[PDB]
Write a protein of this length. Sequence first.
Length: 264
Amino acid sequence: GSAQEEQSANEVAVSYSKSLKAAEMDSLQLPVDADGYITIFDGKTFNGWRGYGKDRVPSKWTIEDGCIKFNGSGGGEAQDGDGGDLIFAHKFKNFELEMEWKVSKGGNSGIFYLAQEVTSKDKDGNDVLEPIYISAPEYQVLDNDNHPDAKLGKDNNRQSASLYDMIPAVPQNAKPFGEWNKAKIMVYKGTVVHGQNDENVLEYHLWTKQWTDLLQASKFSQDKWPLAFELLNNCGGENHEGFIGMQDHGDDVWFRNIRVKVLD
Ligand SMILES: [K+]
Ligand SMILES: [K+]
């Protein structure tokens, strides 16, 4: 029948949550292509998106020219002002995400996945929000030629599309600052693959001895950061699932064409 009815036919109900650790008790009708990718950013609104830990989108995240933009002040991990990491508030388990990203000269951001909203108790019994990165693996987003982090870590494991500070992207086929790069993150039954610019650049396996050993060699080791170790070692929590999101690392960055295929 109508264009409206055909559109409703080529759409799927996608649950989302509205605030810290809330149930996903509302749904968006989102477009799906023939390959099964759900477009999760519509080019115009933040529907389904919110700050990690928040009930709203921080004002440092804007929409511009069909992109999600983070507007940075230059303070790295500080997350000053009305910032913070952004999530699409729908937990995925087995999925393939594709999106494009572009950084400013010298810029740094990241794509998080399998994220959990985590709090801990302070000395007075009050809940405190823990960083997204103590639960969520990080796909690096970087100007590999100008941000000095590119030269740090080991074997270029802090360059774009790396599992940040843990496993390097090989080949390192990033395009330079100001150009669009294509990211792929696939999680399927614990196998994780990163892609960049239509090439697979690393592979790893969650919930294995090898994964534990990698974490024990990281800043999230059991000795250095017990809570992070516990969360990452059983990445995704009891149900092995979580949110996709993007990082406030204080620098201008743009994201577009954000789509996710649910794998079974
Ligand atoms: K929203
Ligand atoms: K980063």
